[PDB]
Amino acid sequence: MDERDALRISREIAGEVRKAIASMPLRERVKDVGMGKDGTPTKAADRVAEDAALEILRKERVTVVTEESGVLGEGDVFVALDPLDGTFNATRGIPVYSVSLCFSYSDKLKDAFFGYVYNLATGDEYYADSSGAYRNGERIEVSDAEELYCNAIIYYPDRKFPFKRMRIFGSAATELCFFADGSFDCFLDIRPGKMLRIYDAAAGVFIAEKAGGKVTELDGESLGNKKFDMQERLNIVAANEKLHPKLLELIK
Amino acid sequence: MDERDALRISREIAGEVRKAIASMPLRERVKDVGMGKDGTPTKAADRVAEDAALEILRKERVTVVTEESGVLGEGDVFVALDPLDGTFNATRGIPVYSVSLCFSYSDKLKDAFFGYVYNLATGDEYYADSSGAYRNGERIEVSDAEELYCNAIIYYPDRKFPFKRMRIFGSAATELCFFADGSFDCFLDIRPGKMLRIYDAAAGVFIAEKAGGKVTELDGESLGNKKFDMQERLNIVAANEKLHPKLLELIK
Numbered sequence: 001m002d003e004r005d006a007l008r009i010s011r012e013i014a015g016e017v018r019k020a021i022a023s024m025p026l027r028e029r030v031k032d033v034g035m036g037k038d039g040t041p042t043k044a045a046d047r048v049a050e051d052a053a054l055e056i057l058r059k060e061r062v063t064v065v066t067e068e069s070g071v072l073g074e075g076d077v078f079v080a081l082d083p084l085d086g087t088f089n090a091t092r093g094i095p096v097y098s099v100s101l102c103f104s105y106s107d108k109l110k111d112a113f114f115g116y117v118y119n120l121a122t123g124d125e126y127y128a129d130s131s132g133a134y135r136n137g138e139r140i141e142v143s144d145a146e147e148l149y150c151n152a153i154i155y156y157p158d159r160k161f162p163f164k165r166m167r168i169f170g171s172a173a174t175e176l177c178f179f180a181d182g183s184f185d186c187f188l189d190i191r192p193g194k195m196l197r198i199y200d201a202a203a204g205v206f207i208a209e210k211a212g213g214k215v216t217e218l219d220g221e222s223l224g225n226k227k228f229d230m231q232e233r234l235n236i237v238a239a240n241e242k243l244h245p246k247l248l249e250l251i252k
Numbered sequence: 253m254d255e256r257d258a259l260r261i262s263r264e265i266a267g268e269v270r271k272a273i274a275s276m277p278l279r280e281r282v283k284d285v286g287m288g289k290d291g292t293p294t295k296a297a298d299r300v301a302e303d304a305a306l307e308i309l310r311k312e313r314v315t316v317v318t319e320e321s322g323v324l325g326e327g328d329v330f331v332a333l334d335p336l337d338g339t340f341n342a343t344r345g346i347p348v349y350s351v352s353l354c355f356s357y358s359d360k361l362k363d364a365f366f367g368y369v370y371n372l373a374t375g376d377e378y379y380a381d382s383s384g385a386y387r388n389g390e391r392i393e394v395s396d397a398e399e400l401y402c403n404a405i406i407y408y409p410d411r412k413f414p415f416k417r418m419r420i421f422g423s424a425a426t427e428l429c430f431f432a433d434g435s436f437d438c439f440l441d442i443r444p445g446k447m448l449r450i451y452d453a454a455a456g457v458f459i460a461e462k463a464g465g466k467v468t469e470l471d472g473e474s475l476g477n478k479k480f481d482m483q484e485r486l487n488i489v490a491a492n493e494k495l496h497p498k499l500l501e502l503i504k
């Protein structure tokens with residue numbers, strides 16, 4: 001499998017999930033269908049999303065790691081799947097939630113070759129490959145502002161911070177693409193409970209990187225060895241190469 | 253002018269303001285075009301919307317306290333209008349921004365008789381009149397949440413908090429409606445500099461209170477004497493009656 005193949009499968013997935021959720025009225029979406037592989041309720045809308053995805057997906061030679069259903073298959077391309085990040089927002093009709101996909105030639109983030117984040121609410125498509133990061137077919141890169149007086153996404157502000165704006169939309173993959181686009185100058189999930197999972201962060205991280213962003217663990221450690229088919233925890237510090245050290249200092 | 257008048261007015265403007273915005277490129281939107289009378293830059297998205305609304309409100313016997321051109325007219329019916337609330341989103345394509353209209357029978361908030369917040373991205377319509385509060389013509393009401401461990405929207409988390417979640421979507425007018433319909437447990441703006449202005453909060457407050465919420469200033473004192481002028485600013489604490497006293501001791 002290559003990137004184009006990856007781009008082709010993701011768009012196919014994007015359309016199906018898009019359709020399944022779009023149909024489901026809020027009061028259906030909100031219902032607990034079961035206990036997720038993640039340890040949190042699997043709501044009716046996450047069930048349809050993950051279903052749609054997994055039907056296109058498992059016709060591939062992939063080992064998939066998905067939010068609700070765990071580790072699936074044994075193929076040697078790993079897919080970090082988030083069938084619907086922003087669940088809370090979709091169950092109440094707030095237009096920020098996506099399907100996020102990250103393909104790797106190993107069970108390690110450092111071998112990622114393709115990243116994909118589709119805005120299920122607005123139909124906004126992001127992805128990055130060996131040619132660059134994109135939004136709705138147009139190239140994108142991170143902003144170049146290096147003052148901490150900036151536009152930050154942040155989970156969570158523990159204290160008084162210097163930011164210009166602080167925002168929390170509730171969708172780690174999409175917010176990372178909000179960082180990738182330059183819409184926001186940084187992204188931070190610095191909660192001492194390292195709560196992010198590999199599939200919520202996988203592609204946005206990848207994509208954040210092709211658009212120029214520097215992205216690391218809390219202490220600036222590399223995200224290269226974060227694993228898939230293991231239950232990985234992530235904290236993220238993501239900014240251009242310039243603001244990046246200052247943030248690192250800022251929370252230290 | 254009647255509660256039934258105010259809604260038809262509000263509806264004209266939302267549709268005109270929605271066409272106007274939807275047809276501007278993000279490129280053309282984020283462009284500064286002047287100093288608003290509120291002390292911030294007017295962006296092109298801001299005046300396009302404002303001109304389109306004002307174009308209609310000018311037919312009515314009112315005084316408008318509007319963000320970009322300030323207070324225009326001498327009618328007896330007062331209208332607070334944020335032409336565009338969430339401009340930063342709007343100029344990013346983040347789909348959370350609205351037109352806000354609050355109509356009062358006088359200068360003060362206590363005389364409000366109608367509230368209207370319309371999401372210009374989604375089409376969602378939030379209004380309230382004597383008949384209560386609505387979301388797209390469906391009766392709404394706030395959360396029943398009695399627990400401080402809840403889903404909060406707050407500006408700005410500066411300390412270690414016990415909410416089950418925290419969110420900040422960038423449009424308080426809109427976010428006041430997410431609490432109004434019970435999509436969130438509480439809205440809090442507690443920024444010490446008291447940032448909010450009347451057109452930010454008046455319609456969201458009126459909608460939420462009609463939805464059964466207790467909405468007050470930072471102390472717990474009512475907002476009834478908040479002024480429909482440009483100098484007015486405020487802090488906000490929003491929750492159901494049981495929860496509301498709780499956040500007051502919390503934020504103490």
Ligand SMILES: O=P(O)(O)OC[C@H]1O[C@](O)(CO)[C@@H](O)[C@@H]1O
Binds near residue numbers: 086170172
């Ligand atoms: O992961 P937490 O603890 O919910 O923090 C918020 C994040 O949760 C995620 O759903 C990840 O599971 C993100 O979409 C959201 O932005």
Ligand SMILES: O=P(O)(O)OC[C@H]1O[C@](O)(CO)[C@@H](O)[C@@H]1O
Binds near residue numbers: 164422423424425
């Ligand atoms: O940009 P800030 O400082 O985060 O303030 C956010 C506020 O912006 C407003 O548009 C008012 O300026 C509100 O809708 C939102 O609640």
Ligand SMILES: [Mn+2]
Binds near residue numbers: 038040041
């Ligand atoms: Mn889950």
Ligand SMILES: [Mn+2]
Binds near residue numbers: 082083084086
């Ligand atoms: Mn999810």
Ligand SMILES: [Mn+2]
Binds near residue numbers: 085199200
């Ligand atoms: Mn997720």
Ligand SMILES: [Mn+2]
Binds near residue numbers: 288290292319
């Ligand atoms: Mn302004």
Ligand SMILES: [Mn+2]
Binds near residue numbers: 319334335337338
């Ligand atoms: Mn505005």
Ligand SMILES: [Mn+2]
Binds near residue numbers: 336
């Ligand atoms: Mn505003």
